[PDB]
């Protein structure tokens, strides 16, 4: 087609607002202020092809997984209406963050104004996924201790809202602060160490291991840490500049660690609801 013809450009001729990683040298999209050209670039080979397809395939995966969860029979749930709500809040954060991300990566090359707008949606999305992750996971760990459950959901929301407001800062999006963005969102997720230690103290090592929690969360902690470490230090494109332009650069694998980490997270809290269904809502444990 003869409409909106464009070629990939090297990194040195890019405008300022499009230089986010100088280790990717060739294969960038040039600035094109047409959404039509941006959305058809999804089927073109460039630096953002993997970044969009990873979180667009992941967005429909958790969308369909989220609707199957709503139509599962209430036969298997101790409180089907509010159990499907806490899970839906996790699915709400998961879908919004993956949709904000692939949309941002698609319209990244449109203009400076559109780029800054969808970048703030991109950063706010990951906070929503972190807060949404905490809701079904807390409502089960503190099932019989309601007041620790309700303070810990207040502070993760005051932290996630603060993380969303700090993402409205413009120097947040600069490449000089890529280590600052790494620690802010990583400290958001690793803030759960305080509710986890509270849970182990009151329930015990055996309880935490029998129910399977300490195994699934150190998987979560590893995916959290490894994903943030690759992003902040730009491995492997830091080692091979100019050979990871299209496939397997840091941002691409970080996207994969988010889809896998959110699915691993769903697997853990879904186990916590099958374990609750077997012992019921009654509570005389002490």
């Amino acid at each position, epitope marked *: 087609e003869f409409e909106g013809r464009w070629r990939v450009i090297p990194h040195d001729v890019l405008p300022d607002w499009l230089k986010d990683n100088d280790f990717l040298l060739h294969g960038h999209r040039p*600035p*094109m202020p*047409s959404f039509r050209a941006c959305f058809k670039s999804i089927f073109r080979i460039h630096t953002e092809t993997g970044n969009i397809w990873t979180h667009l395939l992941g967005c429909v995966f958790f969308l369909c997984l989220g609707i199957f969860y709503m139509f599962r029979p209430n036969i298997s749930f101790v409180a089907p209406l509010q159990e499907k709500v806490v899970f839906g809040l996790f699915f709400l954060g998961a879908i919004l963050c993956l949709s904000f991300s692939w949309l941002f990566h698609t319209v990244y090359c449109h203009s400076e104004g559109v780029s800054r707008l969808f970048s703030k949606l991109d950063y706010s999305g990951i906070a929503l996924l972190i807060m949404g992750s905490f809701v079904p996971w807390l409502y089960y760990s503190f099932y019989c201790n309601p007041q620790p459950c309700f303070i810990y959901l207040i502070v993760i929301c005051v932290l996630g809202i603060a993380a969303i407001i700090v993402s409205q800062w413009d120097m947040f999006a600069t490449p000089q602060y890529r280590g600052v963005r790494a620690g802010v969102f990583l400290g958001l997720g690793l803030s759960g160490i305080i509710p986890t230690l509270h849970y182990v103290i009151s329930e015990g090592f055996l309880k935490a291991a029998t129910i399977g929690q300490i195994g699934w969360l150190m998987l979560m902690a590893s995916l959290y840490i490894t994903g943030a470490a690759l992003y902040a230090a730009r491995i492997p494109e830091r080692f091979f500049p100019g050979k990871c332009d299209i496939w397997f650069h840091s941002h691409q694998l970080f996207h994969i660690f988010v889809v896998a980490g959110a699915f691993v997270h769903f697997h853990g809290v879904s186990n916590l609801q099958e374990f609750r269904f077997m012992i019921g809502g009654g509570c005389s444990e002490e």
Partner: antibody, heavy 118, light 107 residues
């Protein structure tokens, strides 16, 4: 700095041929597309076509399909344009102009004046 | 083919004044527009590309705007060196096309 230097003025007779050479330097030649622009005296600019040094393909304006032919020599980073069977209508200043992803022209040659006269 | 209609064809203004060169495309060009300035006998130089992005080294008094089929080039506080011809260009559809041009004279 990126510079586009093309050949000097040509004085030819009707029915003859000319080849204008645009020599580019200051960048990797295959990375960007080269376009050609015609400007008749006192008139505005007209788009002749675009040439891609990487693939070697070219897209011609229908008006200049039977008039222009784009060639290239990647060893010397030179673009060429052949004009065939020239008439008095082909008296103009011909430019080369380099794209940068999309076909907006940041760099231009100084221009080659082609004068047809018997 | 997309037709580009530039207006006015020519105009003369004093130094320090503001001038506006309008331009209309026969079809939607999706902001794939560029403006150029050409001095007497010299080569044209790009002023604004992508409808609004100011090119490197171009003074801030030049500003491009518009969307769809109606675009505009504005020159605030005219300087003596601003005389010459001005052209618009669309690069959304092939064959790419230029406007008729606008001759600017300073008094």
């Amino acid at each position: 700095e990126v510079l586009l230097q093309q050949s000097g003025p040509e004085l030819v007779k009707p029915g003859a041929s000319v080849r204008i050479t645009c020599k580019a330097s200051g960048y990797t030649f295959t990375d960007f597309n080269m376009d050609w622009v015609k400007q008749s005296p006192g008139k505005s600019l007209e788009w002749i076509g675009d040439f891609n040094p990487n693939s070697g393909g070219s897209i011609y304006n229908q008006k200049f399909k039977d008039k222009a032919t784009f060639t290239v020599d990647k060893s010397s980073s030179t673009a060429y344009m052949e004009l065939r069977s020239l008439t008095f209508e082909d008296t103009a200043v011909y430019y080369c102009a380099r794209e940068t992803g999309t076909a907006w022209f940041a760099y231009w040659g100084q221009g080659t004046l082609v004068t047809v006269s018997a | 083919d997309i037709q580009m209609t530039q207006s006015p064809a020519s105009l003369s203004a004093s130094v320090g004044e503001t001038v506006t060169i309008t331009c209309r495309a026969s079809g939607n060009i999706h902001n794939f527009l560029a403006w150029y300035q050409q001095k007497q006998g010299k080569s044209p130089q790009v002023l604004v590309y992508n409808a609004k992005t100011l090119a490197d080294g171009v003074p801030s008094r030049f500003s491009g705007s518009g969307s769809g089929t109606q675009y505009s080039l504005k020159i605030n506080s005219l300087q003596p060196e601003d005389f010459g011809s001005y052209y618009c260009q669309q690069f959304w559809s092939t064959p790419y096309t230029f406007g008729g041009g606008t001759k600017l004279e300073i008094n």
